[PDB]
């Protein structure tokens, strides 16, 4: 029906806290997804 | 209090179905029970009248 493609950044630690309920500072503050999240989570690689 | 939504939420999902199984059982024995006391009721009845 729609698609939306969140775009952001975060640290190599606390990428688990992208997750429906996860818990973390980020997840506590930034950004935090639905419980009942439905989506794919790609988090490519960008040491570059 | 002690957990966090996700495992909280799986953790109190086994729990409630735990506890659904309990209440489940319960009432299911109970429905047979009130069947005997019903067939009780009804013997009770039959004497009445």
Redesign the interface.
């Known amino acids: 029906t729609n698609v939306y493609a969140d775009s952001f950044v975060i640290r190599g630690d606390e990428v688990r806290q992208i997750?429906?309920?996860?818990?973390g500072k980020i997840a506590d503050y930034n950004y935090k997804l639905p419980?009942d999240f439905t989506g794919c989570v790609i988090a490519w690689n960008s040491n570059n | 209090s002690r957990l966090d939504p996700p495992e909280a939420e799986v953790q109190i999902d086994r729990l409630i179905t735990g506890r659904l199984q309990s209440l489940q059982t319960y009432v299911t024995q109970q429905l047979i029970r009130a069947a005997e006391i019903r067939a009780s009721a009804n013997l009770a009845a039959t004497k009445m009248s």
């Open positions: 997750a429906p309920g996860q818990t419980d």
